[PDB]
Ligand binder design. Structure first.
Ligand SMILES: Cc1cc2nc3c(=O)[nH]c(=O)nc-3n(C[C@H](O)[C@H](O)[C@H](O)COP(=O)(O)OP(=O)(O)OC[C@H]3O[C@@H](n4cnc5c(N)ncnc54)[C@H](O)[C@@H]3O)c2cc1C
Ligand SMILES: Cc1cc2nc3c(=O)[nH]c(=O)nc-3n(C[C@H](O)[C@H](O)[C@H](O)COP(=O)(O)OP(=O)(O)OC[C@H]3O[C@@H](n4cnc5c(N)ncnc54)[C@H](O)[C@@H]3O)c2cc1C
Lengths: 480, 482
């Protein structure tokens, strides 16, 4: 055994997963094909939920001051996100290159074995372990591990070598993205195609080129600038061929998702599990959020404290999130790429987005705060959902207590009787008697059991199963 | 020869002819077809269309009409009951029956309806119109003050005056088949295309075939049934080739609208003015409602009582409505025809329909109750909008605003028995009816009086209208020395 867990890929997903595992004292080897981070800006910022999970690991202070923005929108149609509490899109200026840099520094200091320059070329499941063929700076060797996780992007080697079913719709077009230095472009339903224009920090202009009736090309592959410039000039009639390319990329509208996130001792996360239209503002957030769901569960299984059905909750909870992720990205794409044939439907929708019922509903889709797992029956509003950041009188917060990434039993009523019911699971969770003071708290909530990912598994009152059942379910068997 | 000539005796033509006859305007209607073909086409009509029929006492010519709060937008079910009076009506009554009601009503009102007469040309003589028609005898020329084109989407009148007809061309072809002798279940998202199945009274089944990637075809005749059956089987897997076809037809999704509803002394109404994807449930309702807007205004012009800007309010009011019409049908059409590539958008919208704000909005678009004309400034809720039917205490007799609007003359409703404002409307006596009556209340706020156009829309109301009553009266019912 070279490590309990091997992760292929050091993007946002793999790096977050490595951090989540290391927090739980698990040994993890990360295989990254690239010798360094690309430094691609890609998307700017991340959703409210992603900001919340960073805060749960004390990673927010590492970005400096982030700027919130309730200026959200859906498929080009402007929507107010302030109508739903805390759904504000955030970090609108923080590029993925910076987020990757923060995460890789975080994983490394935690003891992640990040081996850059190593490419996964093969994998077989021994049933009781996984054999991983690797190509590194010396040559081709073989690592073996308890579990393999594929966080190796949309072209995932792991996915193909294990034989995951990857259904969906193929690409119907090609689009261009270009960050440009040296042109004055104004932030804009013309024929020939659609175009988006926006500014970036440091005098950089970001353009999106979606020409009408453009064919989907398999790329290696950064696009040649002149090909992007001619596509642009064909649509807008503005010559930009004398600009300076900061970064160019080509992408398709292909959307696919693995039928199962788990095959034996091999799991998938991020773009490896779900691929979709990159310019939709959800991908990185989905990969980081997949990693936070799986990390503490995979950790418990390795330690042997987990119940036999825990690891399967990764697929159980995250696959529906992925389905809804593809629906969201596909729907927004239609309102974006298609020309005037989609305009009447764009208009009808634009007439509905003023109604606060609609605004809140669309905001919850994008922010990712609508995410609600099935964790059992109960009338409590938090059950299966994220625990919102509460500030506790003890001077700590729920986000701060979740930094070690262990389960929390929060005791608000100072009840000695339920603290004794939790006794067998001592060492697996922390019992914290404190007073909520932030503090959106429903009805007469006296206690709440919080999963390491921040999701509420149980809550008094309003949960069918009682505390010992919820504890056994999410934190494993304990002789009683 | 004729004060007005209408080309076409479908819903738009017949309704307009009736609206003119009510005003005493002599009108000749030209219909190329010797007899009705018997196309059921659509079933039922919208709430607003029901309301305008009630305004002329035409509802009881159908029998009893059945309302339904079960609305739909692009297939997605919507509760129309959340908006008062927006219920779909007559869901069993075919357009052929509605046409038959309107023709008898026109004929009894004195309308000169000439079937077997096809319009072939028109020159606008600056102050008159010369119409060339080929009837039973042969070619002959009619001279008229006004020619209204209600001759359908392939309007000969539109093409002969040179209206601009901008829009989008057809992208596909689709079939309609009224069949007998097949047991077919109504569906509740296939590849190869989509399909609709619905029952029709008389054990007749109605199917819509929309095969994926079918090329648009311009054909004058009906499609052969073997072509509709082979498309159907390609999509569903069910063989219907042994069916008996009542009616077969083929349509495209071309949507165009004339830039101007009026060119000199030639006007357009119905599919002549705006064509779209027939699957939306709006066309006939829009055509009939165009005819109601134009009729009384054109009558005022013929009688020389109209203000010089009244006739242009036909284009002014009905063109934007026609734009909404193309948006509505096209948006809905996308939620029907496109296969699994539209499904994510269908799903999202389906989640929103449950919100009463949304349901009410879509219900207004489809029912026609959203229609609001710019008639002037004011904070009064009814201003420029349709006057809802109000039960009234007429002296000591029960009445209704619908009943009062039957003669198709303007109304000044006095709720508070005020004879001061009853003298402000004195000059326009013989043009409107001043009615002192008491409504239920249903009236918004402290409404004391309301001026109603012959088409049912409120032109002025006290309080909450910037203009004065004499100003509003001059604007809609003509100049009067004072
Ligand atoms: C132009 C653009 C704009 C975007 N904007 C946004 C946005 O605003 N918001 C948002 O949430 N998302 C956005 N995204 C999507 C986001 O960038 C990706 O979804 C995110 O990177 C996915 O994380 P990942 O770790 O799973 O995949 P990856 O980032 O691709 O990480 C995969 C890593 O694994 C490595 N790898 C691949 N194969 C192997 C192998 N065989 N062996 C070893 N290593 C391997 C790769 O080198 C790579 O570094 C955008 C994407 C694009 C292209
Ligand atoms: C399959 C189908 C289903 C539909 N379902 C619905 C529905 O559920 N609800 C709804 O509101 N609408 C529906 N519609 C639309 C509705 O049928 C039309 O919009 C409606 O007929 C428009 O009325 P119109 O008078 O302007 O046109 P038309 O009904 O077509 O009348 C035009 C008349 O002018 C005559 N004409 C043509 N050329 C000449 C000429 N040169 N000289 C003299 N006369 C001429 C024609 O013979 C015809 O009688 C449907 C349409 C189709 C095709």
């Amino acid at each position: 055994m070279d490590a309990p867990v091997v992760i292929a890929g050091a993007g946002p997903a793999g790096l977050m997963l490595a951090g989540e595992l290391r927090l739980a004292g698990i040994g993890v080897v990360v295989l990254e094909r690239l010798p360094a981070r690309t430094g691609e800006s890609r998307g700017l910022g991340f959703t409210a939920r992603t900001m919340e999970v960073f805060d749960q690991r004390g990673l927010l202070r590492r970005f400096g001051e982030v700027q919130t923005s309730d200026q959200g929108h859906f498929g080009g149609i402007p929507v107010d996100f302030g109508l739903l509490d805390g759904a504000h899109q955030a970090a609108k200026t923080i590029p993925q290159s910076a987020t990757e840099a923060v995460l890789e520094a975080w994983a490394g200091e935690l003891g992640a074995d990040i081996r850059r320059g190593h490419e996964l070329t093969g994998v077989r499941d021994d049933g009781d372990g996984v054999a991983v063929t690797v190509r590194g700076p010396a040559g081709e060797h073989v690592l073996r591990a308890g579990w393999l996780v594929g966080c190796d992007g949309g072209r995932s080697a792991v996915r193909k070598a294990v034989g995951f079913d990857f259904p969906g719709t193929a690409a119907t077009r090609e689009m261009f993205l270009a960050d440009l230095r040296g042109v004055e472009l104004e932030p804009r339903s013309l024929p020939g195609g659609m175009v988006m224009v926006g500014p970036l920090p440091g005098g950089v202009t970001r353009i999106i080129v979606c020409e009408r009736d453009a064919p989907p090309r398999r790329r290696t592959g950064p696009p040649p600038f002149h090909e992007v410039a001619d596509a642009w000039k064909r649509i807008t009639g503005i010559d930009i061929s004398a600009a300076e390319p900061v970064w160019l990329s080509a992408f398709g509208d292909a959307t696919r998702q693995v039928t199962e996130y788990r095959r034996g001792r091999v799991l998938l996360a991020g773009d490896a599990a779900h691929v979709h239209l990159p310019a939709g503002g959800q991908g990185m957030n989905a990969g980081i959020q997949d990693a936070v769901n799986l990390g503490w569960k995979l950790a418990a299984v390795v330690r042997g404290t987990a119940r036999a059905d825990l690891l399967d909750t990764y697929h159980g909870e995250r696959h529906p999130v992925g389905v809804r992720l593809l629906m969201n990205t596909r729907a927004q794409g239609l309102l974006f790429l298609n020309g005037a044939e989609m305009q009447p439907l764009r208009d009808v929708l634009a007439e509905l987005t003023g109604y606060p019922d609609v605004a809140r509903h669309l905001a919850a889709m994008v922010s990712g705060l609508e995410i609600a797992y099935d964790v059992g029956g109960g009338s409590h509003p938090w059950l299966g959902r994220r625990l919102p950041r509460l500030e506790l009188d003890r001077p700590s917060s729920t986000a701060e207590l979740l930094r070690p990434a262990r389960g929390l039993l929060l005791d608000f009523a100072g009840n000695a009787a339920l603290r004794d019911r939790a006794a067998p699971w001592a060492g697996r969770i922390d019992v914290v008697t404190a007073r909520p003071a932030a503090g959106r708290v429903p009805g007469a909530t006296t206690a709440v059991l919080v999963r390491p990912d921040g999701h509420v598994a149980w809550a008094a009152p309003g949960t069918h199963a009682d505390l010992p059942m919820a504890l056994e379910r999410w934190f494993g068997p304990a002789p009683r």
